[PDB]
Amino acid sequence: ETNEKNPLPDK
Amino acid sequence: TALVCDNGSGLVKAGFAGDDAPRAVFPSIVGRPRKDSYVGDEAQSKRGILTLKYPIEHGIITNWDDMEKIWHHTFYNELRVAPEEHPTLLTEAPLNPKANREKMTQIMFETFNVPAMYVAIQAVLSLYASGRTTGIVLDSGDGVTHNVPIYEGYALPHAIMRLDLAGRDLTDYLMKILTERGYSFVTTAEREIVRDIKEKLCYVALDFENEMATAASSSSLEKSYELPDGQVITIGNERFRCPETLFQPSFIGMESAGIHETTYNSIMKCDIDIRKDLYANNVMSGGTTMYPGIADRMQKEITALAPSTMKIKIIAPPERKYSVWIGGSILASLSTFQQMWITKQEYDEAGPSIVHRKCF
Amino acid sequence: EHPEFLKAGKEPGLQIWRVEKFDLVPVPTNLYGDFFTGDAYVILKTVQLRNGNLQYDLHYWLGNECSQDESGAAAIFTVQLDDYLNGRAVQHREVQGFESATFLGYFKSGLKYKKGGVASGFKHV
Ligand SMILES: Nc1ncnc2c1ncn2[C@@H]1O[C@H](COP(=O)(O)OP(=O)(O)OP(=O)(O)O)[C@@H](O)[C@H]1O
Ligand SMILES: [Ca+2]
Ligand SMILES: [Ca+2]
Ligand SMILES: [Ca+2]
């Protein structure tokens, strides 16, 4: 199970 | 068990040899407030207080103190290993400066105390992952695009083409033309939103001029994207205009030939006797080759450039964002690889220049 | 150093190995020509040249259902075998249903296929 740790910024 | 670390301009792909995929994929960024620093996903979320720096530019490591922080983060935070226990396969760009290879080797042995290490060329690993020893790789990531012709397992250095047009340039261009459409994408936080639009909505047109006329006489090529705040925005011809830049670099003021032309130029720098095998084995790798339609477009464009009797084949594996890593995972796992590592003992006796004799 | 490399290309003849979980494993001589389509194989044909030297052709055969680790390994083993033989081997990629006339000619009774093979060496993550 790959965890791509790259989340988008919120408001 | 051996570790595999594929360091890119935009993303680190890290994992264990013998796995079918990297365990960890995270941004190759170091953030500082101006806790001293933050690396990867932590640096991304805390960007309100942090200034971000990329230790790798156009595939080449240029900030070695920040690169050590990336590697520390990989070993301890992501893979959660003791480096001294694990042979470590690293990857490098084609034509990576000799002094860089040595520095990489020095850091692994002297800072991280690895028992063994190896450095492989990214494009070659990708070819291996496709089950080939001969072919031409189009590797396009976040920071750089290369054409790498390979014969019987080894790259042909004289024929390698570098193009400083890749994913980040495409993201910046999409920001520009979406701004022209009425929106306001300019800040670094907003860059990542546009990168997501690019990844979800963009595609390569089989015939560009025909697509422009379709988008002008229809709206069936238009899509909607929900911004973080909730604002739904529309994307029209920008969808295919963005990646078209790969084929027409004049779209961003570049004088360079597009990826189809560099592919042909690269093949033409090789011996006429191997070109047939090059044309029949065009392998795409890296995130920027992920656009729907790109393989079909490349097939069309190279057919138009090659002799009419040439068998042309574009290979575009679904897993090609991770092809480099997967090739490394396979390589490190082979029973025949045990003798190929540079050991700590070999490093103690020979110093960093051993990398030029043990690793092509 | 690998025991099968030491055996490779010593005399004229045909040598076949199967990729089995990241290793090169010799195929029993009685089973030559019966290929598992779920698998990948490395084939070395050694020919006696009149000049005293040996001629080498390395073929890596890829089954329609072989896993990525196996086709990847077969390709790499081929490169390594070639290097071990001083670069003198000519490498050939052979895909099921599309094999070269010369490859097919190695099997006097005719090459045949069967479904199945050894499991992938990959851990799924
Ligand atoms: N589906 C997609 N469509 C278009 N682009 C994508 C897609 N998925 C990822 N990308 C882009 O691919 C890039 C990341 O790919 P990759 O991990 O191969 O690059 P890298 O190794 O970090 O950079 P480089 O190889 O240039 O040093 C990013 O620019 C990202 O936006
Ligand atoms: Ca890369
Ligand atoms: Ca199998
Ligand atoms: Ca050879």
Provide a brief overview of the structure.
The complex is a heterotrimer of chains A (11), B (360) and C (125). Chain B is an alpha+beta fold and 360 residues long. Chain B is built from 14 helices and 19 strands.
Distance between the termini of chain A: 29 Å
What spatial form of chain B do the alpha-carbon principal axes imply?
A: globular
Can you list the strand order of the major beta sheet of chain B?
Answer: 3-2-1-9-10-19
Q: Element order, helices and strands of chain A?
A: E
CATH superfamily of the largest domain in chain B: ATPase, nucleotide binding domain
Overall body shape of chain A: rod-shaped
Alpha-beta content class of chain A? mainly beta
Number of strands of chain A: 1
Helix content of chain A: under 10%
Q: Give me the oligomer status.
A: heterotrimer
The distinct ligands, each listed once, are: adenosine-5'-triphosphate, calcium ion
Radius of gyration of chain B from CA coordinates: 21 Å
User: Hey, which two chains have the biggest interface?
Assistant: B-C, 29 and 32 residues
CATH class descriptor name of the largest domain in chain B: Alpha Beta
- N-to-C span of chain B: 23 Å
- Give the radius of gyration of chain A: 10 Å
Count of structural domains of chain B = 3
- Major β-sheet profile of chain B: 6 strands, mixed
CATH architecture of the largest domain in chain B: 2-Layer Sandwich
The tally of beta strands of chain B, per DSSP, is 19
Query: Strand fraction band of chain A?
Result: 15-25%
Protein name (chain B): Actin, alpha skeletal muscle
GO molecular function, one term (chain B): tropomyosin binding
Enzyme class (chain B): hydrolase
Keywords (chain B): Acetylation, ADP-ribosylation, ATP-binding, Cytoplasm, Cytoskeleton, Hydrolase, Methylation, Muscle protein, Nucleotide-binding, Oxidation
